[PDB]
Amino acid sequence: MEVIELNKCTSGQSFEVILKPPSDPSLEEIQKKLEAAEERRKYQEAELLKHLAE
Amino acid sequence: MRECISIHVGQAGVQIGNACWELYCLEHGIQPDGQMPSDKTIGGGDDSFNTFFSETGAGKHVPRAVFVDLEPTVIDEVRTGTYRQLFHPEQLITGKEDAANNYARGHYTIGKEIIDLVLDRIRKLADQCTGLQGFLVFHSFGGGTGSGFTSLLMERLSVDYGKKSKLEFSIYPAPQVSTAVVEPYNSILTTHTTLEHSDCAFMVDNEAIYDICRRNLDIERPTYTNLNRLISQIVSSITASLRFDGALNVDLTEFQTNLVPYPRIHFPLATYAPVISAEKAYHEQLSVAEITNACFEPANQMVKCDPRHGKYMACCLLYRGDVVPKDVNAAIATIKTKRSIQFVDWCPTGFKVGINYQPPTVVPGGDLAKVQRAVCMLSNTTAIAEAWARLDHKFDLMYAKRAFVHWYVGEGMEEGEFSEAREDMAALEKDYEEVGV
Amino acid sequence: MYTFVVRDENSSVYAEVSRLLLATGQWKRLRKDNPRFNLMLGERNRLPFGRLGHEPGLVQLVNYYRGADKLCRKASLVKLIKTSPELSESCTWFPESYVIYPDEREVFLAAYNRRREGNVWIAKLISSEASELLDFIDEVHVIQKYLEKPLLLEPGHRKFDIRSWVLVDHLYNIYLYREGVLRTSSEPYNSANFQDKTCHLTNHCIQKNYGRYEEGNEMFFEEFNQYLMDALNTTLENSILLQIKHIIRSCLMCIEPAISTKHLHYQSFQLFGFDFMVDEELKVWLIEVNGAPACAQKLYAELCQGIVDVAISSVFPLATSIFIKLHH
Amino acid sequence: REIVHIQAGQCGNQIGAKFWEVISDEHGIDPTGSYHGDSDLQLERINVYYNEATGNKYVPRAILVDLEPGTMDSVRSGPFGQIFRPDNFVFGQSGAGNNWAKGHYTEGAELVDSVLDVVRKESESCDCLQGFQLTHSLGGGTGSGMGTLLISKIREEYPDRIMNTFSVMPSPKVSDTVVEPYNATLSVHQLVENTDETYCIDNEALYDICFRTLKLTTPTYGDLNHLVSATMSGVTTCLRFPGQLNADLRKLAVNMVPFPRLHFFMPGFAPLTSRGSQQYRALTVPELTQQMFDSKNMMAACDPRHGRYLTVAAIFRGRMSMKEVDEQMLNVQNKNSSYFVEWIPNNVKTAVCDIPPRGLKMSATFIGNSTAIQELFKRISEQFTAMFRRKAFLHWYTGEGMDEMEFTEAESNMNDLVSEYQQYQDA
């Protein structure tokens, strides 16, 4: 077991033990998708109010 | 010194933030009014605790936190609770009606109304930072706000703070304490939209915390207060390196560097020991070996799974209390011979150890007894994919009948986002299996 | 009542376990995809162990040990024996084996060259020339030393293999069913040619001379013990069964840390089929371990009843033992 | 999170008046609107159903609607009559004559706009309005015909609020007129499209419970309404009291209604009690759970073993072991798992409130979305077709402007509702 990079201080210690070596979307696109969904809510609400008008 | 901003979203996020910040004040010696007598640099300073606390001219130490809920009653308890003086009113943001356990309602309908307000309140804390390093986001997978509004928040934070790291503390849904049937929908949807925006996420299955409270605290019917005090201890172990002197995980970047070699596979498993009941009259204090050995027992993990049938990519041991490196190596030597610990071939087999001499702090009157030494192990094992398998199975059962889909479509969401999100989870499940065959 | 589901319709052993459970009047069967079960008689491939033990208010149990395939695949069994110090490369009861990919190829040829200076090997199919077997492989495999001097029953000059059924419960007790079976070859053992392999392969499917000496080419311990006394002046317990009990215990104690469900959120048991080969000197060799074995018709009733008593009713109790417990 | 209550018709106002009597006693409000209770839990969510007036008075957010003055005069004279805001009494004079057409198209049309003015006045005072709850019968004329006209017009003005109803189903066992299957079929067509949650209170079930179980030989409407007010109290417990779950109407709809048209719930209650007689043995938690799932405690005459539970809500009231509740609730699911759909994981959620109802130490209320409720609509559809195949009694309706085609459409839509429930009973 190799113990490496041992650092000590008043608060404690740290080290590493090795046992074996190895073998996006822009603000524009966000605003558009949020408005596309609000459009779909307004369309479904208009279809409802049109149905109630009949 | 580099500052970290914590963001608590939804009921689960806010209430867990209450637990963590109460614990932080006890550890750092900060009174509920914000005063900290041990701090001799009045009005400022770049000490390690200044990563989480700013300072006023009068000497108050204010958390670099913001609480946001789409409904007021939970944050209203913070506005009137024991630590009401601690927070500035501007960093406590409430709506008027919640997301009704509906991801699409929290992301699209209500989220759009309040996203710009939160981002400017977040901006007010960032301007107080000489070198902001990123954010710690607390939320639930199952809640409509915790899932819906967080994924919208994570999207915008990548735009406004591109060079910044973002760590998640996510509450995985558990039927024993959840009162919503659509949590698998919200969980998959929020994981798909957030995945590329989070650098490292620590999942916490409420089923695991619940059972730990029953088994090791002898609490017959654990409440959120029981769960959150225990969760705050684990969170405190994970963040302690950011708030204290040391050389391991000193910045948010080091979390991804030490625990996440693959961007998509960024869900480390957390194991914690010992959890000892404060009502236990006689208790034999456990050794370094006994508590290090407990880190490989599935009954002590934040997510129930079997690391024997997976592979490790990284492993951290974070000790609090009377611990010296000599005993850790002696304990790791014994454990390696008696347990199935297998690393992926392209990774070195080993452990990064951090020791903080201050023993774990327990809130007075809580359920946890004070111990002489404790440890939190962060291990990126592919065995955590079992939690995705469980979640995706429940998702597939409901979605096959399109049950409850109409609630989401009626909020402006398109049915395709369900399958699109599920497809991503299908890819995520496949990556884990590649790495861990 | 207790609840169970059946996800392997092709299992002859657990089909009988389904009937015996229903006949108690305290077990109700559900549909395969119902999660609110106490017991799962699971599929053989891609069993979803990750979904077990997450139903509140239900103690869940499954008839397979996750990770036991490391012992029940020919390639995995060889790797396990050569790498585990509990068994070591100098294991005296496992034949020399090498894994070949169509690999230890160069290490194998070193043994075959020292064998050039009995060099019959099996690949899994029998051959005496190393190059011929390798040509067959390409058209994963393990090559193994073919035991050239096996114990032959008389009358007949016949080859055989011994199958032992072992049950491992949720507590990791190791129970060896007292009734084994000898799967015999009805054709005399011919050492002069290995291309004709009906006298070498003792599998039941190979036995299409079938049934001459004993019914179904199956000899049980009652008769085989009596033969060993009259012919060789010994008993089945002393000459063979001690080694079988030693091999079964050694294999299962090796993988116990990797498959045990002692501190898990679900439990496991599993029935295994160990296949042994006895040589000219009454020495037992392990051939393979079978993870989903079938029983013999005479023993189906008694064995499946014992699976319920020891592995199922021990966890879900109701409202002389046929097993030998192998102590560890 | 305020709720606006509406009660329409004879039946609507009688059960509505009983509902306000029961919950006013639970919240400690006296017939004059003064609070004389002991626990502050009684007022933490009092704003959901009560407006706070001058002098620390509590006025129910209730609107009382009828086309006759008879029943509403009885309400104003009743024990809690003075608690209602007098302006919220809105009534005509002609009546509706048990005629769905009069309530929906002629007589009720004259009166509906003035009801909507009172509704608007209550809504504009609301901090954040959740939605509306209506109490009515479906077999009469005002509650059935005008009630569904109101619901249609409330949805037009408040399209993003929750519409919840307590709808009483007619039964020849307790029958006023032969035209009740006509009125019910016309009304269910409206309820399918214009409500989010409907508690199906079947008068057949209430009669059988009174007769078979409570041993009442000749039940009155007062005996039936005792069961209704107990159920209405129980299903609104989580809306009125603080607890682990601070529930609202929308979260209830989101979790109970997996398909929009299938939002008709079977209410259940335990223990079953007759008024004026108190039983002194408190029930064990195993007994509450067994009885609340028993068909003999269902308020809709449907055999739950003939269908499958889509979703289930259970609310326990009293001081009891929440662990024993979890074990017993899990025991019912694990022991009858065939009757709960496998394609909605964990579809039974439980809530606990420490305040028991008046006169009980422990109680349990059941809200089931079962596919067996098609039996109720089948029953009403059979009685409908029995008369409609001969166009019998149709002149009462065609004289108010209606066409036979409208009856044909209503029959079809309900028969579609029945077949839709049968779709998920096999899956």
Ligand SMILES: Nc1nc2c(ncn2[C@@H]2O[C@H](COP(=O)(O)OP(=O)(O)OP(=O)(O)O)[C@@H](O)[C@H]2O)c(=O)[nH]1
């Ligand atoms: N550990 C823990 N889990 C919680 C807590 N509160 C809620 N949960 C879990 O979170 C899930 C529900 O999400 P919530 O946070 O309550 O909902 P929300 O984020 O506020 O979103 P909405 O209420 O739908 O607007 C359930 O699975 C609960 O079990 C908590 O305080 N601690």
Ligand SMILES: Nc1ncnc2c1ncn2[C@@H]1O[C@H](COP(=O)(O)OP(=O)(O)CP(=O)(O)O)[C@@H](O)[C@H]1O
């Ligand atoms: N090293 C060896 N020496 C001699 N015979 C051997 C041998 N290895 C295998 N055999 C013969 O081959 C026969 C079948 O081989 P094997 O048991 O590996 O195939 P299998 O797995 O398809 C049958 P099952 O699964 O039922 O045990 C055995 O019965 C044995 O007689």
Ligand SMILES: Nc1nc2c(ncn2[C@@H]2O[C@H](COP(=O)(O)OP(=O)(O)O)[C@@H](O)[C@H]2O)c(=O)[nH]1
């Ligand atoms: N459960 C119950 N049902 C009632 C009550 N009053 C009337 N009904 C039923 O409601 C139907 C009559 O409708 P009703 O409300 O009286 O006529 P409306 O005033 O025009 O709405 C019949 O099926 C009655 O059985 C009551 O107090 N309780």
Ligand SMILES: COc1ccc2c(c1)NC(=O)CN2c1nc(C)nc2onc(C)c12
């Ligand atoms: C089928 O799953 C659910 C069923 C019901 C609910 C929820 C989930 N979740 C919720 O937030 C609201 N809710 C409830 N609403 C009301 C008005 N009364 C209730 O009594 N007990 C529960 C629980 C409950």
Ligand SMILES: [Ca+2]
């Ligand atoms: Ca300072």
Ligand SMILES: [Mg+2]
């Ligand atoms: Mg919430």
Ligand SMILES: [Mg+2]
């Ligand atoms: Mg085999």
Ligand SMILES: [Mg+2]
């Ligand atoms: Mg009447």
